[PDB]
Amino acid sequence: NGYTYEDYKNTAEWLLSHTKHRPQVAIICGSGLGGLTDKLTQAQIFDYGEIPNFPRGRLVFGFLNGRACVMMQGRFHMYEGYPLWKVTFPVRVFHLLGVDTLVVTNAAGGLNPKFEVGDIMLIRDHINLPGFSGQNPLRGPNDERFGDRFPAMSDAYDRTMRQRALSTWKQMGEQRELQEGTYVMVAGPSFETVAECRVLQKLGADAVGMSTVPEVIVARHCGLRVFGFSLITNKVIMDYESLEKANHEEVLAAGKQAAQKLEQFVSILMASIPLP
Amino acid sequence: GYTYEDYKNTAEWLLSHTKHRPQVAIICGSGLGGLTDKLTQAQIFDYGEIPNFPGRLVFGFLNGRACVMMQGRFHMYEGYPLWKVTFPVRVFHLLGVDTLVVTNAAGGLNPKFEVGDIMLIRDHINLPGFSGQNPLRGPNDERFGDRFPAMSDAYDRTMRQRALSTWKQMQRELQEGTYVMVAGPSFETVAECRVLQKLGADAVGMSTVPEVIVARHCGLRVFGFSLITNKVIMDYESLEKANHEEVLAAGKQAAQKLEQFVSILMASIPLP
Amino acid sequence: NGYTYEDYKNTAEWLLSHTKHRPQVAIICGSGLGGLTDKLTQAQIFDYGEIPNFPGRLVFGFLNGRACVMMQGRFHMYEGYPLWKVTFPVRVFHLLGVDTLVVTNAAGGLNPKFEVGDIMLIRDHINLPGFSGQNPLRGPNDERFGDRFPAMSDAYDRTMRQRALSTWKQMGEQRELQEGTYVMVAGPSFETVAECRVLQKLGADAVGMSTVPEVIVARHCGLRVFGFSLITNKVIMDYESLEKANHEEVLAAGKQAAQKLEQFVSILMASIPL
Ligand SMILES: O=c1[nH]cnc2c(Sc3ccccc3OCP(=O)(O)O)c[nH]c12
Ligand SMILES: O=c1[nH]cnc2c(Sc3ccccc3OCP(=O)(O)O)c[nH]c12
Ligand SMILES: O=c1[nH]cnc2c(Sc3ccccc3OCP(=O)(O)O)c[nH]c12
């Protein structure tokens, strides 16, 4: 909405002049991935504040397991009051840098009763509840330099990468298996009532969270390959008996507990991404 | 952003610039590009020449019925507020129109639907409406209608019956069901398609519901239909994807059929 | 959000300087509660127009001896108010020292067991505007009000619903107190048959156009919440019917229930924790 094509190009040109790094892969770090940047070789850090036209967090360029990457440490959320054209601005910039693959991670509440806290859910699909009612990051004039006016989302989550994620996990010899299912985005920031949890379950959602879907829609619009996963930080309360309530402290704690596992998994998975 | 006087000024400008007095407004969806080509005594106004208009408005006779056709409609996905999207409907009321015919393209959710099927809209599901994107949001003007209008009778029962009889007197049956509006402009995921099916929607599209709500608010009779341009993808196996090119192509293929159907249907609209 | 913390504080300080009344309970009067203020002792009236930063009247006094402030007239999303205007009074109530919110409304019946005139205790809600971004907490969080990510699963105080059921029983009323899930939709137009079938399948017992925003802001600031719906009409759920939902029937059901609702709320004040 408030960005011109030239604004995206200006940001891209600034980054390309300020780093020799040329990323193939953008990684939008969700809950548990705070310290993924700590595994980079030839790390180069830009605070969002230094970068022209960035919403008012760090961008880190380097090699993860020898793959050229740019990592978003801190992401923008609808609940913070950012319009979706600010939330998704970095994805357009990543395209103009030459990125062809987006890895997106988040925290989610478990709606699938088979899910346990600490489970990693590969995102096979999403339900965009804000999108239905008008909150789609593509709303407004389309620029054909980014992509088509009416892009398909039915193939948003790369089938090959989900297969390679399953095989990678198996070779790490981890105690618990990978989950796979549907992420529903809600705006938040307040957690769901029992009645709302039952709604999202009946809609066929496996996990609920407050991000990711906008970035994926913009990535697919630009032609990026997309892979995503949720850390299941908590089981959403689905009955009136329970005196447990969802809280941010338990989300942070589950993230901290999973951090080493998630970092290792993403690092190893870089080897499985197709070459440019 | 419009005052009552803005609507009135637009209506007065049109009434002074044409001798035509339409009874029927037709909002042309996918496939109806060339419906204006069937008008007698055709008179064209580019949106740009019309005061307060956010494309062309064409006045004339379709099968001898006094009509005004919207060629080009405004969509939520284009970034228009719903008070711009639905502005023409208020104007139509002030011109003396008593009937709105609304057409669109839609994706098939009902597995019985085939590409090229015409679905009479019996009802709608307003997903943007639930969350606040209702064109009536804001102060109500009683000169247009009631603060809290009913929508349960939005799609005129008589016109749906006469549409079925007209169709019979023209290879495939006329479908009938529920249209769900989503904002778009991206097409639905498989999971989203399963949601709209479980909500009981037969067809999905990206328009129409706003105009219908404003039309019913103003007391217009409403008739609508969808051209089923594509079957929405409902399983992960398929390598088929929804695309705008297929929507345009289905529209072009159905155009002669849709134009003939609407033209003949004019004869079935009640007199004022 | 167009209000700063200092704006809420300025409004609260103005009211605290202009009345000696110190309410424990805020009552947001829905359909049928027009005349509840007429039962207050030591009543003191402020027109919204007089009150700094207010987007109707605020009445302070004692209801059955309980210190209360009553909103007569509430702001609705369908009027064009942003939710940060709709819910502004709730923040003010917190700063006045209110610890309990009583919220009332009119609703359409989705549950086929419900009859017109039934009172439904709200056990839970479904926030349809909230899912899509219309949450009154959207924007920067102020920790002086509450947490960035508050839970809503315990929004409707269990104890007050138990005491409401026992209070009802002691009034010896013809019909039982209903209980269930309120779904907020923005309106202002009434639902289609297909939309009524959606809300039923989502598990909603009753539909209306308010309340959920106020509750979310109340819970964010740590208020105890009790709420109920007057069932003004049974929503049309089949194509055969020539009945339509209309505002006149909503007003008429409100008028018919008014004496019953006023008595119920008055008696219930005695059951609120100190
Ligand atoms: O139960 C749940 N309901 C709804 N959302 C959630 C989330 S996500 C979440 C919650 C609080 C703060 C931040 C969060 O995510 C940030 P991000 O990873 O998308 O960057 C966990 N649990 C539930
Ligand atoms: O599968 C589908 N999902 C969601 N919407 C659709 C539409 S409508 C449509 C699609 C692309 C561009 C424009 C469109 O409509 C314009 P209008 O007819 O309302 O003026 C067809 N098929 C699907
Ligand atoms: O069938 C119904 N559908 C949807 N909403 C309703 C309501 S609430 C309502 C209706 C018309 C006008 C105002 C109303 O609310 C005022 P408040 O009590 O929230 O302040 C009753 N019946 C139905």
Numbering used by the authors:
A (entry chain A): 3 to 58, 66 to 285
B (entry chain C): 4 to 57, 66 to 181, 184 to 285
C (entry chain B): 3 to 57, 66 to 284
Article passage:
Purine nucleoside phosphorylases (PNPs, EC 2.4.2.1) are cytosolic enzymes involved in the purine salvage pathway metabolism in most organisms. The enzyme degrades (2′-deoxy)nucleosides based on 6-oxopurines to the corresponding purine bases and (2-deoxy)ribose-1-phosphate. Purine nucleoside phosphorylase (PNP) is a well-known molecular target with potential therapeutic applications in the treatment of T-cell malignancies and/or bacterial/parasitic infections.
Central phenyl moiety is located in the pocket formed by Phe200, His257, and Phe159 provided by the neighboring molecule within the trimer. Phosphonate moiety of compounds mimics the position of the phosphate ion in ImmH cocrystal structures and the position of the purine moiety is also conserved. For hPNP/18c, the reservoir contained 0.3 M magnesium chloride, 0.3 M calcium chloride, 20% w/v PEG 8000, 40% v/v ethylene glycol, 0.1 M MES/imidazole, and pH 6.0,53 and the drop consisted of 200 nL of protein, 80 nL of the precipitant solution, and 20 nL of 1 M ammonium sulfate (added as an additive).
